[PDB]
Design an enzyme around this catalytic site. Structure first.
Site, PDB file in Angstrom:
ATOM      1  N   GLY A   1       0.815  -1.200   0.000  1.00 57.04           N
ATOM      2  CA  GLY A   1       0.000   0.000   0.000  1.00 57.04           C
ATOM      3  C   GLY A   1       0.852   1.255   0.000  1.00 57.04           C
ATOM      4  CD  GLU A   2       2.366   5.207  -2.324  1.00 57.53           C
ATOM      5  OE1 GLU A   2       2.505   6.250  -1.650  1.00 57.53           O
ATOM      6  OE2 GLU A   2       3.243   4.753  -3.074  1.00 57.53           O
TER       7      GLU A   2
ATOM      8  CE1 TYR B   1       6.456  11.493   6.933  1.00 55.37           C
ATOM      9  CE2 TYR B   1       5.928   9.660   8.375  1.00 55.37           C
ATOM     10  CZ  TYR B   1       6.054  11.022   8.169  1.00 55.37           C
ATOM     11  OH  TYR B   1       5.782  11.910   9.168  1.00 55.37           O
ATOM     12  N   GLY B   2       5.730   6.945   1.912  1.00 57.71           N
ATOM     13  CA  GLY B   2       6.032   6.322   0.619  1.00 57.71           C
ATOM     14  C   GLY B   2       5.401   4.961   0.432  1.00 57.71           C
ATOM     15  CB  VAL B   3       5.411   2.581  -2.412  1.00 56.63           C
ATOM     16  CG1 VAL B   3       6.880   2.558  -2.793  1.00 56.63           C
ATOM     17  CG2 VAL B   3       4.709   1.291  -2.804  1.00 56.63           C
TER      18      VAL B   3
ATOM     19  CG  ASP C   1      -1.211   8.961  11.040  1.00 55.60           C
ATOM     20  OD1 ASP C   1      -2.422   9.249  11.257  1.00 55.60           O
ATOM     21  OD2 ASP C   1      -0.764   8.696   9.921  1.00 55.60           O
TER      22      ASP C   1
ATOM     23  CG  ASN D   1      -0.928   2.697  11.788  1.00 60.74           C
ATOM     24  OD1 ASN D   1      -1.676   2.428  12.713  1.00 60.74           O
ATOM     25  ND2 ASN D   1      -0.634   3.934  11.383  1.00 60.74           N
TER      26      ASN D   1
ATOM     27  CG  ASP E   1       4.517   2.819   9.932  1.00 63.36           C
ATOM     28  OD1 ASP E   1       5.408   1.921   9.788  1.00 63.36           O
ATOM     29  OD2 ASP E   1       3.642   3.086   9.068  1.00 63.36           O
TER      30      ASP E   1
END
Ligand SMILES: O=S(=O)(F)c1ccc(Nc2nc(OCC3CCCCC3)c3[nH]cnc3n2)cc1
Length: 280
Positions: A10-11, A14-16, A118, A123, A136
């Site tokens: 997924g995306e 901060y990035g892929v 977040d 997540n 994360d």
């Protein structure tokens, strides 16, 4: 070089994120491509933050203005599990197990002065053995549409100093969503998010939240909604559950329950560790 991509998971912010295999060791991992030496040192510290309810950071690789984070891979996220459980609902003993484990994760990181900032179903990651783990942690601090649905009110009101309480708020919102099978506060703008919170918990004032009216984005013109009852908010849930959720959604971050204190709440008197049925 060393990693064979298997599929895009997924995306992130901060990035892929890819599922990948280490061509050398055969280890299967999650690889995050992050799209400043401050950030390098902060991330490196996170490699030491090891707990069974925190997704392990295996390595940090900077090369050629590229930063890659290598994580432990888990096979499903809470969002997909909730969606798969939507007709039936997640059984309360599994909700309770998951909450307890996430609070243990939070308690650990918070004791090391690390925040997530977040948290969201995407997540929170699960495995076949009944474990749930937070992915994360520390990344928001390290690196500086994104969902607003789990954002604590002090963040929305422009507080510059985030406390551990912001993570308790997010996890309370997730708890409610596991129980009801719908998002508690699904705002689609910062003001819509704030007003959805106020419509449910009442517009905050100096009685319930000393200092609120001096916060940066506080406006005296905010509509004044009365608080609704938690009985209406997460209905099926028993009085121990409702008690704990209420303490996790206190407006004043100083009154909001800590992870450590929440683990001692009466709701967890009968906690167990069920195994979910996962379809992978
Ligand atoms: O249910 S699904 O089949 F969709 C599924 C989802 C996740 C995974 N595994 C997974 N994902 C991660 O991060 C996803 C990322 C987090 C938030 C931002 C955007 C998405 C991981 N980070 C560390 N280890 C990870 N393992 C396996 C299947």
């Amino acid at each position: 070089e060393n990693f064979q991509k298997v599929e895009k998971i997924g995306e992130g912010t901060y990035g892929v994120v890819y599922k990948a295999r280490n061509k050398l060791t055969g280890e299967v991992v999650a690889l995050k491509k992050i799209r400043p030496s401050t950030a390098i040192r902060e991330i490196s510290l996170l490699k030491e933050l090891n707990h069974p309810n925190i997704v392990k950071l295996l390595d940090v690789i900077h090369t050629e203005n590229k930063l890659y984070l290598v994580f432990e891979f888990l096979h499903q996220d809470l969002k997909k599990f909730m969606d798969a459980s939507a007709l039936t609902g997640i059984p309360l003993p599994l909700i309770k197990s998951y909450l307890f484990q996430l609070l243990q994760g939070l308690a650990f990181c918070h004791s090391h002065r690390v925040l997530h900032r977040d948290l969201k179903p995407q997540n929170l990651l699960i495995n076949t053995e009944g474990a749930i783990k937070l992915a994360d942690f520390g990344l928001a601090r390290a690196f500086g549409v994104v969902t607003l649905w789990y954002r604590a009110p002090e963040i929305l009101l422009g507080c510059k100093y985030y406390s551990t309480a912001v993570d308790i708020w997010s996890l309370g919102c997730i708890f409610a969503e596991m129980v009801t099978r719908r998002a508690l506060f699904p705002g689609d703008s910062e003001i819509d998010q704030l007003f959805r919170i106020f419509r449910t918990l009442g517009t905050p004032d100096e009685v319930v939240w000393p200092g609120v009216t001096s916060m940066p984005d506080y406006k005296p013109s905010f509509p004044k909604w009365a608080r609704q009852d938690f009985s209406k908010v997460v209905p099926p849930l028993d009085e121990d559950g409702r008690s704990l959720l209420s303490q996790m959604l206190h407006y004043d971050p100083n009154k909001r329950i800590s992870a450590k204190a929440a683990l001692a709440h009466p709701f967890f008197q009968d906690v167990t560790k069920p195994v979910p049925h996962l379809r992978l």
